[PDB]
Amino acid sequence: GEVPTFKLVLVGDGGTGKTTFVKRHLTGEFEKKYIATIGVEVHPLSFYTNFGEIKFDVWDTAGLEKFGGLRDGYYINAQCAIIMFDVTSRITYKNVPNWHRDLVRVCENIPIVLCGNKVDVKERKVKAKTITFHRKKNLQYYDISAKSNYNFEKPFLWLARKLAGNPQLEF
Amino acid sequence: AGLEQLLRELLLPDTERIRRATEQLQIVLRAPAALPALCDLLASAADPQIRQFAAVLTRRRLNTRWRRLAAEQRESLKSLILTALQRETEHCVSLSLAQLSATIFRKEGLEAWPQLLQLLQHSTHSPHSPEREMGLLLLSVVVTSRPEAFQPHHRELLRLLNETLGEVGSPGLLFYSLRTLTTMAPYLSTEDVPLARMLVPKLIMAMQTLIPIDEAKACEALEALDELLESEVPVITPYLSEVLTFCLEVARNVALGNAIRIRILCCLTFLVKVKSKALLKNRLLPPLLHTLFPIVAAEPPPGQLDPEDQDSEEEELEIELMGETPKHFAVQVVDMLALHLPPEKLCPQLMPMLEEALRSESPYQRKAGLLVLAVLSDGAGDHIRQRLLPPLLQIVCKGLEDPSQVVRNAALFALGQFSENLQPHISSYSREVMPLLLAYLKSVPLGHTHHLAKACYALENFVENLGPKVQPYLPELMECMLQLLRNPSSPRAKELAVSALGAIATAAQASLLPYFPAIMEHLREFLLTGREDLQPVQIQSLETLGVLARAVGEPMRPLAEECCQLGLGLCDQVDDPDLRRCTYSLFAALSGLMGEGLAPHLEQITTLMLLSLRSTEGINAFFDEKEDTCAAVGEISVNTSVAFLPYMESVFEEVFKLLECPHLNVRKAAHEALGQFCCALHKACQSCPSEPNTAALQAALARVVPSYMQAVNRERERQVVMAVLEALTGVLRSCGTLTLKPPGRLAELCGVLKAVLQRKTACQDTDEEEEEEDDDQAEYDAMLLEHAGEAIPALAAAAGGDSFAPFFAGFLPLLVCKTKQGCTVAEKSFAVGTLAETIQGLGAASAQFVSRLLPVLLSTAQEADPEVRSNAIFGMGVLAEHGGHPAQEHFPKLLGLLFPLLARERHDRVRDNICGALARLLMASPTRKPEPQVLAALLHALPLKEDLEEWVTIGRLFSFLDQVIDVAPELLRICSLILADNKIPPDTKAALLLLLTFQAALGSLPVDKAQELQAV
Ligand SMILES: Nc1nc2c(ncn2[C@@H]2O[C@H](COP(=O)(O)OP(=O)(O)OP(=O)(O)O)[C@@H](O)[C@H]2O)c(=O)[nH]1
Ligand SMILES: [Mg+2]
């Protein structure tokens, strides 16, 4: 009988590494063929902390193919979300404020951390001084590694901090 | 309506996969026939959890469904919105209804819904609290809906603000009011009553209450406050210190997330860049420094080691550049504080706090000191230029002996920004600090490539600017990188070592000879390499070998014999433009050095060059790669014999098609690549080919000229104006009268280019604005003027009395504006130089013009500058041997020229030009002249230590036997004083040595010639 239950909804444009992100958090491997992620799926994941193993919910929301618009339905009752962006294109960065406006019209405050995938490439387009929107909009930022699994647990640790607020939550 | 809610009750928690795939059947196809409310609103009366996204779907539908909606469809919705406002049970539900009201307020604009105004009055009165806060939130969202449509209501809203001043109550009401003024801020009134105040105590109390409640609410309060000030607000200026004092003293509450510090410091920075003159009136800096000093030396409450305190730190190999910790953005905040204000005396004012910061016993005090050096380190060092130029030359050394070893890194960084911010100070008392720094850095080869990389970046960087000074430093530096050179270590160590080798190579140019044979073995080892994981080291070694080839040439023939194919061979293993960077430069330089030596590897290299620009990469930016390849063809202009004759047609036309592209830098690269074909064809033709080759290359020149001609005025831009100007000057300097074949470039081109300069310029525009992203744009156009200095002389000396020769007269009146006493010394120097080439280019026709312009030259006379006007000073001479009869017109004007000013002489240049001009005047004709007098005076003050252009005067005066002999002892003593010196032109042959044979010189030797010249 585990008491701490927390639903997590991931947000981002389709085909932006979200499926790879969740599948790497499942077992830690990359699958080569690209399939446009459609629909939604649940991946019950429990991670170890000082309070034991804590279970979490996953919502594999993606796919701008269906005629019917249901993208806004998943946004209800969610208390946490994570945002992606690509480092090789300006469109993701200029779409970040659109994601900000839609999330704020969803809820007035939700802990959100800016995260950008596909950093394993040796050449990097989005140079660091460009990344200033989150600071002035009061959004926290972590980085993710596509190979070394850097920040594999620490974004979730930050999520745990915001869930509890007591700084004694450790690995 | 029944089945929908039944689906929702089960699909809300975790839905179903099959229910996820249902979608369109779950949507129930919408099927809108009329759908007023029954299948369009579901009566809006159920459990609100469904009702939020029900309203969301209604919004999505109505965003497009309003094409046939009837009139009896708006009163119903607004009445239902009012009922929902009265029927509220949850905060999120109220938020959703407010959002729906704001987003249904999207159209029909004004002139509608009086009931919102009546609700506005109700909320202003609103003795009941919860309905008051709901009214405040709905007014806030409707204001958010329309940014500035209700300008007349602004006063009303401002008057509404007065009521909001009266209730310092529930935190929700304060949050609503401040987020309301958040959207109010973009109104930018700046003209309403300045009496709008008392908001400061309310926001102080709001953030005070939110410290234990929520950090973020005060956050949005502060960016709201920051957005409030954007223009000349009449009320913020008088009382501003109180809010910053409050925010810092509440930041002294360490029991808070660092975001509090983040946005107090950013709000302070914006307050400063808005204005910073208030601190002139009151001493607000010292309290700020006392406040931030604990921040600079902040200590974790549990003593937790910093992320920079880990010994290993083997993560994030590529690059990190994090700055979220308080110390970093604190040091950038204080640095922008320092740089934003003028120097004045603030640095001497903070010195008494500086030696207080200098107490460094605890390591945290040591980081505090290194950070105060970091902030003091600025672009302008005028304060440190005059006082304590080596201000702390041993404290930086005392920081090396630090067990915490982070003070060493901080000192390394500080020396970094000293190197690339204080240019004059790189030539200072560094005679002893550099070797010990190198020694202790190479004394710790623990494998931490981060410290080695930052050392390589910060060191061996400014010394390259010092050319003569680095030779005494040649030996020791080797036993620095040989500490890790060619030793088993990480590839990062190898790339660092080879980059440093390139750095000292640049610093030492051709002075590498004494120890270079020891670099022969390293070069042979590293060049004969290659592995599946050693790409970056091989690439960097490639461009550093290119730098070696550029720096030292002919002495490298034994080294130049190889590398013709060994480096070339290692390209087929992997195909990548990144892998192909700078590869063209090395073989290009090899071709330039060999001449015909590239004949064996001449065709395959051409094919590999061809298969670099055909790639459709483009067809701060990813396209920059192309530029590199483009630069390759530039070197082809140096020396390629005539092997490119069939190759040129293979590329040029495609390169022609590359002159047009939206990207500016690729256009600049293409244009500078075009700028070298003139030299290529000219060097091909000078090496005597057959006459058919001459005709073919002349036809090529004729077809290529219009490509340059079309760019004389078609361009509408600033950045490429320079490039086109030097390219046209070079192509004109790379040719001659053969470019004069089309009789349209003689006057029309010259007139167009003259009209382009100064006024009537295509670029000199002001009506258009900059809606795109801007840049530094530091008014480069002014320098363009002096760049135009080389525009005139290009083929200027090619008419000599042609039909277009008296064309400069069209530009003559504008030059008058140059000589008016309303410009700077640079403008006068530009004008006098330009007139110098115009007068030296032509003859009698220009001689009469300059004769008529002589009163202007006399008006210029002698200004207060050691190096101005010298161009005309020798211009009188150059016209003295020019013109002919115009020179004979004005002998009295020619002689004299306010000669007594030789006593005023302070600079060598003006003396040399005066002497040369007078020599030309004297030797123009063997006639009477001042002779012994001015001649003796100029001989007396004749060191001629820097007359690097007027050896021709000395050569021509020699053996030119008017009067004879003249003052022989003076010239004899002067030439004996000159004596054997550095490299000299053919001037010195027949320097009156044989004329001694005269009799007086032999009998009366000048002082004592036997000291060095016993016989000769
Ligand atoms: N092929 C491959 N791609 C990788 C790998 N690691 C990261 N990537 C990046 O992932 C991208 C794959 O594209 P997609 O299949 O559409 O994955 P995605 O961009 O995250 O889109 P979604 O799958 O919808 O989330 C490539 O462009 C790579 O930049 C890898 O190991 N193999
Ligand atoms: Mg993916």
Side-chain angles (χ1 to χ4, degrees), chain A residues 15-21 117:
Chain A
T16 50
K18 319 176 286 191
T19 305
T20 61
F21 173 86
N117 60 340

Side-chain angles (χ1 to χ4, degrees), chain A residues 13-22 30 34-35 37 117-118:
Chain A
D13 291 331
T16 50
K18 319 176 286 191
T19 305
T20 61
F21 173 86
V22 63
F30 203 90
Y34 163 55
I35 296 90
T37 307
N117 60 340
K118 321 183 186 184

Side-chain angles (χ1 to χ4, degrees), chain B residues 9 57 87 280 367 399 498 511 585 634 836 969:
Chain B
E9 311 295 331
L57 276 296
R87 180 193 70 258
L280 274 60
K367 277 74 70 177
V498 65
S511 178
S585 56

Side-chain angles (χ1 to χ4, degrees), chain B residues 156-448:
Chain B
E156 182 180 1
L157 267 298
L158 170 62
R159 206 189 282 275
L160 259 68
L161 294 174
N162 310 138
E163 284 86 7
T164 71
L165 311 195
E167 50 274 9
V168 288
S170 173
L173 177 141
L174 304 175
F175 167 71
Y176 294 163
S177 63
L178 282 71
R179 189 270 298 164
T180 300
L181 59 87
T182 303
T183 80
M184 183 278 288
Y187 186 89
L188 317 167
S189 175
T190 300
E191 52 86 22
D192 213 320
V193 285
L195 54 87
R197 193 35 73 82
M198 295 298 102
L199 57 88
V200 159
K202 287 188 296 291
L203 59 86
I204 296 303
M205 295 298 102
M207 64 184 73
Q208 200 176 249
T209 61
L210 270 294
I211 297 299
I213 289 290
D214 190 3
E215 176 163 351
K217 302 290 95 176
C219 295
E220 315 107 340
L222 281 72
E223 69 273 15
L225 294 174
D226 291 331
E227 173 62 29
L228 294 174
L229 73 165
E230 218 70 24
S231 300
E232 67 275 16
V233 183
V235 72
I236 61 170
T237 45
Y239 284 170
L240 73 165
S241 51
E242 73 287 359
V243 298
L244 55 89
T245 58
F246 182 76
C247 70
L248 56 86
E249 66 90 17
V250 65
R252 311 287 70 70
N253 180 14
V254 294
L256 207 51
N258 58 351
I260 193 66
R261 275 75 172 176
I262 297 171
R263 82 292 184 276
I264 62 170
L265 281 71
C266 61
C267 84
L268 183 63
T269 48
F270 293 69
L271 294 174
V272 176
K273 36 180 158 302
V274 171
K275 70 164 302 314
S276 63
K277 278 71 65 179
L279 59 86
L280 274 60
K281 271 71 55 175
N282 44 17
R283 325 277 67 72
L284 59 83
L285 282 72
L288 294 174
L289 277 296
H290 294 89
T291 301
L292 61 90
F293 182 76
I295 297 169
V296 180
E299 185 76 40
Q304 153 65 36
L305 277 298
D306 308 335
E308 314 157 348
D309 299 348
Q310 278 70 19
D311 205 7
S312 170
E313 288 179 15
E314 288 164 2
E315 69 275 16
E316 200 170 8
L317 302 185
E318 51 166 70
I319 193 66
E320 50 93 19
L321 271 295
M322 283 74 74
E324 69 275 16
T325 78
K327 45 185 183 293
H328 295 105
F329 61 78
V331 67
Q332 288 87 20
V333 165
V334 298
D335 203 292
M336 61 79 71
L337 294 174
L339 62 92
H340 191 66
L341 284 86
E344 295 173 350
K345 64 90 176 179
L346 60 86
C347 299
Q349 188 274 331
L350 62 95
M351 294 298 102
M353 283 73 74
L354 179 72
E355 69 274 15
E356 190 275 331
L358 294 174
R359 54 211 60 181
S360 63
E361 196 277 328
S362 162
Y364 274 78
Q365 303 166 215
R366 301 174 184 177
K367 277 74 70 177
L370 274 296
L371 264 64
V372 305
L373 286 76
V375 54
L376 286 174
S377 61
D378 204 2
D382 43 14
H383 282 173
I384 210 65
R385 283 184 180 101
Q386 58 89 26
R387 59 88 174 173
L388 279 72
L389 182 138
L392 71 165
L393 204 58
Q394 302 303 321
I395 312 301
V396 296
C397 291
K398 86 180 287 188
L400 312 186
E401 191 274 330
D402 172 67
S404 182
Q405 69 85 30
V406 296
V407 184
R408 294 147 76 95
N409 313 137
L412 190 155
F413 182 76
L415 183 63
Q417 70 268 13
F418 301 156
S419 314
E420 68 274 15
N421 294 115
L422 278 297
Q423 166 263 325
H425 298 75
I426 77 186
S427 61
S428 70
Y429 293 99
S430 64
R431 310 287 75 72
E432 71 290 346
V433 288
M434 295 298 102
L436 55 89
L437 294 174
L438 294 174
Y440 90 91
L441 294 174
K442 297 318 294 288
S443 311
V444 192
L446 294 179
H448 41 72

Side-chain angles (χ1 to χ4, degrees), chain B residues 861-925:
Chain B
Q862 291 80 13
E863 295 89 350
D865 175 272
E867 65 265 8
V868 71
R869 175 59 150 80
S870 296
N871 308 85
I873 301 299
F874 67 75
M876 282 74 74
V878 308
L879 62 86
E881 70 261 11
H882 279 346
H885 51 287
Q888 316 161 27
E889 174 190 348
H890 37 76
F891 293 75
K893 264 61 60 174
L894 294 174
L895 61 83
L897 294 174
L898 203 57
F899 179 72
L901 270 293
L902 75 164
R904 187 262 181 193
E905 286 163 346
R906 302 291 100 90
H907 208 278
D908 172 56
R909 265 76 170 179
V910 294
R911 314 183 290 99
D912 307 337
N913 320 307
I914 292 168
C915 299
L918 183 62
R920 303 330 201 180
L921 183 62
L922 187 148
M923 185 179 288
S925 181

